[PDB]
């Protein structure tokens, strides 16, 4: 029930994916170059025996899981979420990784404070 | 005459309803305040007159969704009460809104329609 407060951590040139969404997390609605959500529309989608509510629109398992698409949503995601989170990095096309170290981030709380676990990655082309 | 006295006090509970929303969540205390100011609302194209609220209005319910936000209690009180009630009084106050090109932060969404309820109220207490 407990969000991170912040993003996870930005690699150069790598993604962070997630494989189970967990009941807290929210999807952003977010359109495509030109495109507007609706007034009076949803800013964003949230999950919660435990499925997603609201939907997204445009014009200019223990979790939920990823939710279908919506006309004009803009190519890249966006979330937020809530601690347990493990989210996956992985490289670019054009790029390779190291893995000089684990290569996810996990959505933590020490003492009242929300973080990321940092992840070790880096991607040569 | 009366009218006017009776409109400028729904506009005063109307716009500490908004400032006290808009200092709850303008403070340091608040973690998520970086994450709602991330999202933008919609902007009147002016707000002069009292039919301009229809703008407030259409963006009452992507507001709300910015408020569940904050998962603790500083005011300590559901937002759909605030919402409802801020909704109550922006309808004793039906009509077509064009909105500003650009979105703009919750905290800018809000000192706008502040500023334009005291506006307003004293606007009336003319004559």
């Not at chain 1, 170059?33 to 997204?56: A, E």
């Not at chain 1, 990321?116 to 040569?124: E, F, H, N, S």
């Not at chain 2, 609220?53 to 300590?76: G, I």
């Not at chain 2, 909704?87 to 979105?103: G, K, P, Q, R, S």
Request: hydrophobic share 35%.
């Amino acid at each position: 029930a407990e969000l991170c407060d912040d993003d996870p951590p930005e690699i150069p040139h790598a993604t962070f994916k997630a494989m189970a969404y967990k009941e807290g997390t929210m999807l952003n609605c977010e359109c495509k170059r030109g495109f507007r959500r609706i007034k009076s529309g949803s800013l964003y989608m949230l999950c919660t025996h435990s499925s997603w509510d609201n939907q997204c629109q445009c014009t200019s398992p223990g979790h939920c899981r990823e939710p279908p698409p919506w006309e004009n949503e803009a190519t890249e995601r966006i979330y937020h979420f809530v601690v347990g989170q493990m989210v996956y990095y992985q490289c670019v096309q054009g790029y390779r990784a190291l893995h000089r170290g684990p290569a996810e981030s996990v959505c933590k709380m020490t003492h009242g404070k929300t973080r990321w676990t940092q992840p070790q990655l880096i991607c040569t082309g | 005459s009366s009218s006017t006295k009776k409109t400028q006090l729904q506009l005063e509970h109307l716009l500490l309803d908004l400032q006290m929303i808009l200092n709850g969540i303008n403070n340091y205390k608040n973690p998520k305040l970086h994450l709602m100011l991330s999202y933008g609302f919609y902007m009147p194209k002016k707000a002069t007159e009292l039919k301009h609220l229809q703008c407030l209005e259409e963006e009452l319910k992507p507001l709300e969704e910015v408020l569940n936000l904050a998962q603790s209690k500083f005011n300590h009180l559901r937002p759909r009460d605030l919402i409802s009630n801020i909704n109550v009084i922006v309808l004793e106050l039906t009509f077509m809104c064009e909105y500003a090109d650009e979105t703009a932060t919750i905290v800018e969404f809000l000192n706008r329609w502040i500023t334009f309820c005291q506006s307003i109220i004293s606007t009336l207490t003319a004559a």
